[PDB]
Amino acid sequence: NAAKRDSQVGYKTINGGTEVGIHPSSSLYGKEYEYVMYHSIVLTSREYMSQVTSIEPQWLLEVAPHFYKSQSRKKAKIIPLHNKFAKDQNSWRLSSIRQSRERALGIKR
RNA sequence: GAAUCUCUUUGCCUUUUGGCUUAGAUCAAGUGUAGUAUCUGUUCUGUAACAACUG
């Protein structure tokens, strides 16, 4: 039961990629560490981890080289920075410019 | 020596590039229907002689 701190969605689980969270009653709420292990986990309105400690990936390797030791790097994608003035953050694309052109001309595929 | 025809190099070029400026400048991603162009395929393969008249 360990967790990896992702910048966009907060925390991913090592098993299955479940978006979890730190409970505010814990000691580690206002602070952040990158790799943490959690004693318990509760499904509610939001996930919550309980008894969370900082951990280093050297320890997670030297203890368990049998549970584990790319493809997720290949399947990833990125999206640009968000602006308020654009009103649809896909309209910069060449596909969306093509679609807006062919809609204004009035053709249909 | 000289004429006629015909072929090689050698001359001739004889349908043998007729202005300028910011290369004068920009850009070639639309649907249907229609016109024009072209391009692939298949099969099959009366005449002569004799007898008579010259009108």
Q: Using alpha carbons, select from A1, A12, A4, A18 the residue that is nearest to residue A67.
A: A1
Bridge partners of residue A10, in order along the sequence = A6
Report residue A12 as tokens: 């991913």
- Determination approach: cryo-EM
Strand blocks (E) in chain A: 2-6, 10-13, 35-42, 48-55
Q: Using alpha carbons, select from A17, A61, A53, A16 the residue that is nearest to residue A35.
A: A53
Report residue A2 as tokens: 């360990």
End-to-end CA distance of chain A: 50
Q: With a 7 Å cutoff on the CB, does A102 touch strand B?
A: yes
Distance A58 CA to B50 C1' (A): 134
Dist CA A67 CA A93 (whole Å) = 42
Nucleotides in chain B near protein beta carbons (<7 Å): 29-31
